Amino acid sequence: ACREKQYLINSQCCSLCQPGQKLVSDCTEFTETECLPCGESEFLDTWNRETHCHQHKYCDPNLGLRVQQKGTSETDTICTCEEGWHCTSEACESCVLHRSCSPGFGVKQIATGVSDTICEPCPVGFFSNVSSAFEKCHPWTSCAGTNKTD
Amino acid sequence: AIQLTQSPSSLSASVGDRVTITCRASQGISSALAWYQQKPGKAPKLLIYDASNLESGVPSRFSGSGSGTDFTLTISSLQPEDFATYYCQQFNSYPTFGQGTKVEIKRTVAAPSVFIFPPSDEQLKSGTASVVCLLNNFYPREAKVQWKVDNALQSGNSQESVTEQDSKDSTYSLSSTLTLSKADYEKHKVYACEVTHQGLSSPVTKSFNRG
Amino acid sequence: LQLQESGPGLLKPSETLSLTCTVSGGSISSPGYYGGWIRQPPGKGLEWIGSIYKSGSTYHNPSLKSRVTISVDTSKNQFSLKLSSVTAADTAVYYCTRPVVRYFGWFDPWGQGTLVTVSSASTKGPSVFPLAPSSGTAALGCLVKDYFPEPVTVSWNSGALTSGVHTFPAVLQSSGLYSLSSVVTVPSSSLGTQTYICNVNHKPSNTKVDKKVEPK
Numbered sequence: 001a002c003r004e005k006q007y008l009i010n011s012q013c014c015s016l017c018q019p020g021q022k023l024v025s026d027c028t029e030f031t032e033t034e035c036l037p038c039g040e041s042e043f044l045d046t047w048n049r050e051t052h053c054h055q056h057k058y059c060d061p062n063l064g065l066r067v068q069q070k071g072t073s074e075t076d077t078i079c080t081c082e083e084g085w086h087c088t089s090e091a092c093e094s095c096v097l098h099r100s101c102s103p104g105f106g107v108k109q110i111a112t113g114v115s116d117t118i119c120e121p122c123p124v125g126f127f128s129n130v131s132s133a134f135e136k137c138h139p140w141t142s143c144a145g146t147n148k149t150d
Numbered sequence: 151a152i153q154l155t156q157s158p159s160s161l162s163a164s165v166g167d168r169v170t171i172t173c174r175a176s177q178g179i180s181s182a183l184a185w186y187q188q189k190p191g192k193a194p195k196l197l198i199y200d201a202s203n204l205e206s207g208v209p210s211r212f213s214g215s216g217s218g219t220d221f222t223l224t225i226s227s228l229q230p231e232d233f234a235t236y237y238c239q240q241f242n243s244y245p246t247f248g249q250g251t252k253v254e255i256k257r258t259v260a261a262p263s264v265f266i267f268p269p270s271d272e273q274l275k276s277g278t279a280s281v282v283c284l285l286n287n288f289y290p291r292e293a294k295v296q297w298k299v300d301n302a303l304q305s306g307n308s309q310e311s312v313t314e315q316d317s318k319d320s321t322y323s324l325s326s327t328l329t330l331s332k333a334d335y336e337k338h339k340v341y342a343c344e345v346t347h348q349g350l351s352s353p354v355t356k357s358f359n360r361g
Numbered sequence: 362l363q364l365q366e367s368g369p370g371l372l373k374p375s376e377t378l379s380l381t382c383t384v385s386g387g388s389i390s391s392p393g394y395y396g397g398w399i400r401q402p403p404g405k406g407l408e409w410i411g412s413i414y415k416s417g418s419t420y421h422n423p424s425l426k427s428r429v430t431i432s433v434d435t436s437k438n439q440f441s442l443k444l445s446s447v448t449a450a451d452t453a454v455y456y457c458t459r460p461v462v463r464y465f466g467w468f469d470p471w472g473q474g475t476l477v478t479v480s481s482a483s484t485k486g487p488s489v490f491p492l493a494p495s496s497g498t499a500a501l502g503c504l505v506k507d508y509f510p511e512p513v514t515v516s517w518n519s520g521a522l523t524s525g526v527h528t529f530p531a532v533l534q535s536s537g538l539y540s541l542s543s544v545v546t547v548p549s550s551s552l553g554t555q556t557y558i559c560n561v562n563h564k565p566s567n568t569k570v571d572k573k574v575e576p577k
Contacts, residue, residue, distance in 0.1 A: 007462070009181050009200055010217070023463075026180055045416075046392040050463040054418035076416045091436045184467035193456055193471035194407070205469070237407060241466030244422065245409035263546070265500040268577075270490040273504075282492055284500055284544055286527070311529040311541060325529045325542050327504075358495070 005047045016047040020073040023049045038073045045074055064095025080113075087114045098133050104147035106137030122147050152176050152240055154248035162256045165320075167228050171251045173221040173238035182242040185214060185223045187234045188250075190314040194237060198223065230255050233315045255320035261349035262288035262324070266342075266356040269335060279335035283343030283356070285324035287316075290348065295326040298342040298355075304328060336360070362387035364457050364472040370565050371478050371510040378444040378477060382457030389415050389438050395460040396433065396440035397468060400453040403476075410455075412464040413440055420464045452479045478510040482537055485509045486566030489559070491574040492542060494552055498525075501574045502544035503559035507536065514562035515543035522557075552576055 002013045014027030017035035022044055024034040038044050042053030056071035057079055064085030071077040081087060081095035088096050098111035101119040106128050109118035117133045126137040127148055140150050153176040163169050173183060181201040186194035196205045198214035201221060211226045223236060233255050239247040262285035269279040285293055291312065297304035307330055313323045326343065342357035368380035382396060389396070398410035411421030413431045421429040430443040444451060454474040461467050485508055492502030505513050515528045525546040531539040543559055557574045 007200075008203055010202075043416075048393070048463070052420065052464055054414045054416045057417055089436065093434075093436075182466075186468075193474050194468070195471075196467065196469040199461070199467045199469075239407070239466060239468075241460075241463060243465065244420065245412075245465050247407040247409075249406055263498070263500070265495075267492040267495075267502070270493065270504075273488070273490045273506075276488065280490070280504055280506065280540075282502075282504060282542060284502070286500065286544075286546060309532045309534070311532045313527050313529060323527045323529075323544075325544070327532070327540065327542075329534070 007049055016049055017044070018047060019045055021048075022053050023051050041071065043071055043073055043076055045076070064097060083113065084111075085113065086111050086116045090114075100131045100133040101128065102131045103128050107132075107134060110134065152179060152243050152246050154238055154240060154246060156236075156238060156248040156251045158251065159249055160252045160254070162254045163228050164256045165228055165230060169225045169228055169253065171223045171236055171238075173216070173223070173248050175219045175221070175240060178218045179240040179242035181217055182240055183214075183216070183221045184239050184241065186237045186239070187232075188237065189234050189317070197236075228253070228255070230257075230320045231317045233317060233320065254315060257289050257320040259349040260287065260289040260321060262286055262293065262345060262347055262354075264343065264345045264354050264356050266358060268341070268358055268360065274332050274335070277332050279330055279332055281328040281330075281335075281341055281343075283326045283328075283345075285326075285345055285347075287319070287321040287323055288347055288349065289321050291322045292348065293324060294346040295324070296344040296346075296353075297326070297328045298340075298344060298357075299328075299330075299338045300340050301342075362459070362470060364459070364470060366455060366457050366472045366475040368455070368475055368477065370476055370512075371480060371482075371484055372447055373481055374448060374479060375446055378442070378447050378451065378455075380442045380455055380457070380475065380477075382440050382442075382472060384438045384440075389433065389440065390435055391415075393462075395464060396431075397458040397460045397464075397466075398431065398442045399456045399458055399468065399471075400451075401456070401474075402450075402453045410442060410444075412460045414464070447479050449479050451477070453477060476511055480510065482509055484565050485538065486563050486568035487513060487561060487570075489561050489570045489572045491559075491572055492544060493574065493577040495576070497549050498546045499549045499552055500544055500546050501557055502542050503561065503572050503574065504540070504542045505561050506540045507534075507538040508540075508563055508566065509538050510565055511539055512563075513539070513541065514560075514564075515541075516560045517543070517545055518556070518558055519560060 006013050009026050015033045021035040027033040038053035044053045057077040059065040059067045059079040064081050065079040066082045068080040069078040085095040099117050106122045108120040111117045122137040155174045157172045183201045185198040188194045202214040235250040237247050237250050265284045267282045308328045310326045344353050344355045346353045363385050365383045394415050397412040411431045413419040419431045433440040456474045457472045458468040487505045487508035490504045494501040528543040529541045531541040
């Protein structure tokens with residue numbers, strides 16, 4: 001019954017608040033809609049009549065998140081995984097600490113941060129002594145060896 | 151929290167009658183009131199938003215008004231499919247609803263068809279016996295059932311359930327279930343359900359013999 | 362645009378409640394898309410649990426401080442609720458919804474609602490016995506006995522037959538097991554001609570039964 005970027009109150013076609021800004025009070029026949037900015041850690045990404053700004057995403061260090069792009073009054077924080085942490089989904093929503101590779105297995109491919117340590121059976125003639133996310137299968141040196149001992 | 155008080159909380163009304171329900175807010179909520187209709191076993195259905203804007207798809211007999219502290223929902227000609235509970239809610243602060251206003255349809259008096267059903271055989275193998283009496287399509291809701299086993303007034307071994315008012319014909323129906331062991335069920339022969347209702351001139355009694 | 366709630370209909374005291382709301386017919390990614398959780402104890406009023414913007418930003422009823430987690434999964438087009446340390450007080454029909462213009466409302470559309478019962482008692486499937494017609498119009502039915510938890514679903518002739526049907530509210534027996542009947546009136550001259558089957562679904566116990574009702 002009205003235009004885009006407007007809403008209908010009391011048969012009055014009121015303006016919505018622009019992105020960046022939240023509704024403080026509705027228009028009247030004599031007053032425009034009253035909008036104020038969102039605080040530093042909040043945002044509002046649409047033409048709105050929302051009274052509480054969305055909180056920016058917290059990039060929690062305790063879930064392997066760190067800030068990538070910082071929030072604005074119009075846009076959310078974007079997070080990403082810290083070094084040492086990879087995405088649990090191809091839609092990186094939370095981060096798992098890079099897995100390591102137990103003895104008798106070596107390292108095919110080191111963790112990306114959008115992918116986990118890829119891990120390979122140490123073939124006959126090769127061993128891994130310990131568990132790390134880095135060290136690979138090594139040969140037995142010349143003086144028995146096992147998948148895990150020289 | 152903002153409290154919303156609806157007046158009244160319950161009402162009987164006739165088809166064609168005009169019904170107004172009010173919603174008083176404990177504080178000003180500007181125009182941010184909505185009204186919902188809930189039919190039994192169904193979710194609330196938006197009727198009205200921003201106090202007076204009627205939701206697309208909803209009939210025009212429904213209208214909204216008010217501002218600040220006092221709101222009204224008005225139904226300008228109650229049809230039978232309007233039986234429901236009506237709720238206002240505010241979204242000026244963190245959401246709160248009122249207690250609801252139940253709307254019953256007043257209609258002509260209408261007598262129950264009464265039926266009675268014996269235990270099924272499979273149930274008796276199981277060792278218990280449920281005898282069921284059905285009061286179908288009656289008005290008003292007020293009704294007495296009574297269980298007589300070989301003319302003995304039964305007491306405290308029955309339970310009843312009642313349908314929500316029908317959306318078309320504004321009737322209620324009732325089930326009474328007499329429960330007793332297979333043991334007692336076989337000690338007796340004549341099983342009677344007696345029904346007393348405003349639309350009956352004398353109690354109606356249906357019954358069966360085991361056989 | 363529709364919403365469906367999914368979760369368990371039975372849950373013990375102190376366990377955590379986990380519900381999920383699935384959105385079809387529209388994407389949760391659109392600007393302005395919020396989700397919300399409302400609930401309603403049986404035969405009582407409505408309480409808002411919380412709302413969430415697709416961003417993940419969220420508000421919730423202060424009356425559930427430190428108990429409510431609400432999450433959004435853009436990828437699967439779902440949003441969720443966790444209610445920790447549940448009590449009989451949280452038995453209710455839980456509804457997911459779309460807060461339309463802000464966190465606080467209004468709410469449109471809703472989902473069907475999923476009942477959650479908080480109880481120590483074990484799940485259990487119904488016995489279904491016919492309510493046999495004897496002798497205008499006749500009445501027949503099915504008695505659905507000794508089940509827990511609620512609800513049970515009764516149709517007739519796979520949906521074919523809706524006229525004249527009354528499924529009564531379940532009644533709770535001494536045993537702490539529910540019981541209802543579904544009945545229907547039909548023309549007497551149908552009795553030995555039409556076939557009358559009642560279809561009972563108790564999802565909590567994984568029982569679907571179809572009982573055929575004959576003149577005894």
